[PDB]
Amino acid sequence: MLIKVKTLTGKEIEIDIEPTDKVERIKERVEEKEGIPPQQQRLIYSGKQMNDEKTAADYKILGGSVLHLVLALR
Template identity: 70%
Template sequence: MFIIKIVTITGKEFELDIENSDTVEKIKERLEEKEGIPPAQQCIIYSGKQLKDDKKTVKDYGIKSGVVLHLVLALRGGNYISEKGFYNFNKATQSGKNGFHSSARFILME
């Protein structure tokens, strides 16, 4: 058994005791107990990559003692947005860019 750190999108940090044989699914169940977020709405990021396969174990992903996992919400839905629907931030003022940056967080997932 060893300890890993979990960091939420809000910056909250806590530790979990896990074993090499624990699956991603089991970790999500424990996170639901701790944070109240259903596993289907959880997205766990390790070393910049999403842990997509709930059946894989901690050992499969190479997770070791002391690592940090990031817990974010898995957003669903949406619609196609044409290229015209994207905002060009190159034209924004610096204060506009700073305001946007401070109010949003993005995670790129494959």
């Protein structure tokens, strides 16, 4: 399942995931291509901060779905 992860400055990245994949894995995919540690990532879908322990299916994510990535300093 190909989804988009968009940032405020406009750049997008395609991430391949599955309905059973946990949000933590999505962050790990972003880390693979961007080098941003999962702990510094905040993924938002439909105005909701995505929980690391939950799965893509819990947010009803489909092909083409756009997630929003923002930095969260720790």
